[PDB]
Amino acid sequence: STSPEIASLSWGQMKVKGSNTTYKDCKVWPGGSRTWDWRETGTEHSPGVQPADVKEVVEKGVQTLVIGRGMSEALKVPSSTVEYLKKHGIDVRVLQTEQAVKEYNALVAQGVRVGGVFHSTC
Template identity: 90%
Template sequence: MLMASPKIASLSWGQMKVQGSTLTYKDCKVWPGGSRAWDWRETGTEHSPGVQPADVKEVAEKGVQTLVIGRGMSEALKVPPSTVEYLEKQGIDVRVLQTEQAVKEYNALAARGIRL
């Protein structure tokens, strides 16, 4: 049986909680059956140029149908076209939104059983 995508339980400035995890994340990656902290230092991510293909590769490889990318509360985090193209080439639907909107969209899709 395929694992369900965990819902985002709560969101506030600099804090995110994911269903099924006791951790509080600053930034996180979520996929069907799990989540983990997203440390920008792993790939040298900065607000600009933003989310790189290397940042989303791990989640893309978990068999997601849709990937929702939050740009931060004040939308300071950029998502370049190269990252969107990388995901679309793998048949993944990409949604880039302000973080509060991204969480609402993610939870609505998760409730419908979409693999996120």
């Protein structure tokens, strides 16, 4: 449905207005959110963010997708992963988390269909 608000962000913890839970790492999109457990894809800081990590977001319907790659971006992001999104007409924003949530919510403020995945730590 609509894009929620990321209420709060601190090391290893994030808050999304609308969720009965504050996760560690998370996924957000018009309609809701969800815990982002790398194990579901066995994702590590390398190869890094996998298309499988953000597909569930893409299949929800977003114009822009924001990737929170951590507080130091120690987690890389495959270029094939970004092109993958762009190949779907999606605007991609790759940022350090603290700054990543700032773009996300801003977009949320101007009512854009935005989604994303965030790494609350490094």
